[PDB]
Design an enzyme around this catalytic site. Structure first.
Site, PDB file in Angstrom:
ATOM      1  N   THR B 155       0.765  68.427  39.947  1.00 14.03           N
ATOM      2  CA  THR B 155       0.067  68.779  38.725  1.00 14.03           C
ATOM      3  C   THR B 155      -1.074  69.843  38.837  1.00 14.03           C
ATOM      4  O   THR B 155      -1.228  70.590  37.869  1.00 14.03           O
ATOM      5  CB  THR B 155      -0.181  67.620  37.727  1.00 14.03           C
ATOM      6  OG1 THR B 155      -0.614  66.458  38.424  1.00 14.03           O
ATOM      7  CG2 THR B 155       1.032  67.342  36.781  1.00 14.03           C
ATOM      8  N   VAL B 184       9.489  60.251  42.677  1.00 11.08           N
ATOM      9  CA  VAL B 184       9.208  61.579  43.208  1.00 11.08           C
ATOM     10  C   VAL B 184       9.396  62.567  42.066  1.00 11.08           C
ATOM     11  O   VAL B 184      10.427  62.536  41.382  1.00 11.08           O
ATOM     12  CB  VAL B 184      10.094  61.922  44.425  1.00 11.08           C
ATOM     13  CG1 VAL B 184       9.747  63.290  44.990  1.00 11.08           C
ATOM     14  CG2 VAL B 184       9.970  60.863  45.499  1.00 11.08           C
ATOM     15  N   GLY B 185       8.377  63.397  41.855  1.00 12.07           N
ATOM     16  CA  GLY B 185       8.378  64.428  40.831  1.00 12.07           C
ATOM     17  C   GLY B 185       8.854  65.757  41.365  1.00 12.07           C
ATOM     18  O   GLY B 185       9.518  65.814  42.406  1.00 12.07           O
ATOM     19  N   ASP B 186       8.509  66.827  40.648  1.00 10.30           N
ATOM     20  CA  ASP B 186       8.883  68.172  41.015  1.00 10.30           C
ATOM     21  C   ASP B 186       7.991  68.746  42.085  1.00 10.30           C
ATOM     22  O   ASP B 186       8.472  69.581  42.853  1.00 10.30           O
ATOM     23  CB  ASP B 186       8.837  69.075  39.782  1.00 10.30           C
ATOM     24  CG  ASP B 186       7.428  69.376  39.295  1.00 10.30           C
ATOM     25  OD1 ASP B 186       6.840  68.518  38.609  1.00 10.30           O
ATOM     26  OD2 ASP B 186       6.867  70.414  39.701  1.00 10.30           O
ATOM     27  N   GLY B 207       3.593  69.993  34.578  1.00 14.32           N
ATOM     28  CA  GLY B 207       4.271  69.466  33.404  1.00 14.32           C
ATOM     29  C   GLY B 207       5.125  68.273  33.716  1.00 14.32           C
ATOM     30  O   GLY B 207       4.913  67.587  34.726  1.00 14.32           O
ATOM     31  N   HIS B 208       6.107  68.035  32.853  1.00 17.34           N
ATOM     32  CA  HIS B 208       7.047  66.929  33.015  1.00 17.34           C
ATOM     33  C   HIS B 208       7.976  67.199  34.192  1.00 17.34           C
ATOM     34  O   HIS B 208       8.909  67.992  34.084  1.00 17.34           O
ATOM     35  CB  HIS B 208       7.826  66.636  31.718  1.00 17.34           C
ATOM     36  CG  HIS B 208       8.587  65.348  31.769  1.00 17.34           C
ATOM     37  ND1 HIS B 208       9.827  65.223  31.185  1.00 17.34           N
ATOM     38  CD2 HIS B 208       8.271  64.177  32.373  1.00 17.34           C
ATOM     39  CE1 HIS B 208      10.214  63.977  31.422  1.00 17.34           C
ATOM     40  NE2 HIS B 208       9.315  63.316  32.144  1.00 17.34           N
ATOM     41  N   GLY B 209       7.658  66.563  35.317  1.00 13.93           N
ATOM     42  CA  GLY B 209       8.349  66.713  36.592  1.00 13.93           C
ATOM     43  C   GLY B 209       9.853  66.662  36.574  1.00 13.93           C
ATOM     44  O   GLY B 209      10.497  67.470  37.245  1.00 13.93           O
TER      45      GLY B 209
END
Ligand code: NA
Ligand code: NA
Lengths: 298, 295
Positions: B155, B184-186, B207-209
């Site tokens: 982020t 786990v996100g981006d 943003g939205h991962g």
């Protein structure tokens, strides 16, 4: 509407005459399951999952049972699956004591608001979904114990599928045991969208194999699809992407591609890559460059 | 060459008059550290790491101390760093009880034959590298505890171009409020959380991962630049595609190999700052840009 399924093993070469036949039968079986799902009107996602489950269960392949061992002699697995219609995806990394990481990746996609779970949380999710825990020992093969000892002593000094269904949807599935003697918690390219594979109905689907770090650095699967977008054939795209990985990061590997138009190819920069493709009632198979067998599929 | 550093916070909602000033000071501080490293002849990698360490340590930002809480009220962090020269990278996911995930991502890059470590293995590696273990509570803020309770009842990053022409990105996060254990996100995924290539430029996203991962946002931005688009057109096209295709909102910062840079977002806001040619650029809301001099 002509469905296609393409499957790959891990770049393996060289192999004993008798193991070569077990690999061949494994590839045929995976493509048969995949094609069978497509022929009954099944989705591209079900087809790639079915094909990969077969390879995970087959001890001859580096995924599920037959996964290479990490530095501690343990099986730590990664997997990802993607739906080309809405770009929906599921992925798992550093999973242990489960038979089928690809089924867990499918579960992440369908049952959670996420598309990537790792280690402890992925293990907890598997338990909550009623996925049976198997002795980690049931995934370990003697050939992989020898490979690990060989690797550790020398230091003295990756399966998948792509499909195009009857309705025009594309999908990929990739599953692996990783690299021999890897560090605990090492994550490869396999669970990473754009690297381990990529699926988009507006372009096509790719599933990769090879040196994971190199595949991650070059975003191999998404890169292949970028050349297709730019007007290159599936063959030119695969050659260009693999070629770039070789020159830029000194990495070798392979990939399988299916375009939205039905063109497909299996290409590799490693010694070999077991692969099979099924389309228009025909089965295509190979392991070494320019050595392909085609048989009729009733 | 003229070095550039661009930094970003996480897309934020309408915030309190006094919170905006702490945010402003945090962004200025991150860009000041980054630019200071560049001006002394430091690498793009050192600059992006320095800027991100600042944001991790700052409780105002969703990384390190100030990270959003998972479903169990715990801090689980992800981070990645990439060097555009050789495409060398380091990443960590689901890391806990460490102050600086970006420093651990840098250690994965420099001290291992890998570029991505997760959870237990990343924690073992951190211990073997002498990274101090901090209590989980030290990363938890009261604002985050409230955010979690609110959510349950319903982020950060940097890009740089150094004096030697190298580009780099660093991205660090606490993830998304009330996320599942081990989500786990981006942020730790190359091509999604960011991408750096000397032949194109560097991108760091927010943003939205899940949306960022599905569209490969950072690598996508760079494909548009490769095709001849300006940094602004590339950012708009990539963010626009994420919005239309997967219904995802977010933001990104870009630096091209030619020195062009931009900060763009589809979310409400995105704190950002850029430093180039002795000038500091800053903003949060669309078209609220302030420029100040720096010797
Ligand atoms: Na197997
Ligand atoms: Na922080």
């Amino acid at each position: 509407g002509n469905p296609i399924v393409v499957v790959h093993g891990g770049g393996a070469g060289p192999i004993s005459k008798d193991r070569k036949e077990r690999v061949h039968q494994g590839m045929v079986r995976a493509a048969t399951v995949g094609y069978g799902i497509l022929r009954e009107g099944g989705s591209a996602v079900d087809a790639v999952e079915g094909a990969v489950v077969a390879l995970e269960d087959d001890p001859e392949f580096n995924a599920g049972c037959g996964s290479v061992l990490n530095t501690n002699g343990e099986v730590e697995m990664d997997a990802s699956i993607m739906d080309g219609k809405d770009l929906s995806a599921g992925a798992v990394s550093a999973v242990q004591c489960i038979a089928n990481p690809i089924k867990l990746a499918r579960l992440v996609m369908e049952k959670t608001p996420h598309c990537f779970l790792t280690d402890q949380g992925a293990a907890q999710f598997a338990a909550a979904m009623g996925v049976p825990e198997i002795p980690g020992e049931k995934l370990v093969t003697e050939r992989n114990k020898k490979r690990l000892e060989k690797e550790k002593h020398e230091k003295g000094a990756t399966v998948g599928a792509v499909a195009l269904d009857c309705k025009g949807n594309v999908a990929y599935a990739t599953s692996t045991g990783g690299i021999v003697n890897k560090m605990v918690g090492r994550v490869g390219d396999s669970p990473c969208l754009g690297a381990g594979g990529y699926a988009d109905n507006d372009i096509g689907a790719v599933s990769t194999t090879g040196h994971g770090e190199s595949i991650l650095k070059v975003n191999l699967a998404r890169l292949t699809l970028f050349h297709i977008e730019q007007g290159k054939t599936v063959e030119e795209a695969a050659d260009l992407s693999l070629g770039y990985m070789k020159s830029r990061v000194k990495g070798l590997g392979g990939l399988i591609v299916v375009s939205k138009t039905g063109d497909w190819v299996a290409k590799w920069t490693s010694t070999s890559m077991p692969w099979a493709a099924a389309k228009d009632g025909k089965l295509h198979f190979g392991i070494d460059p320019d050595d392909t067998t085609i048989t009729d599929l009733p």
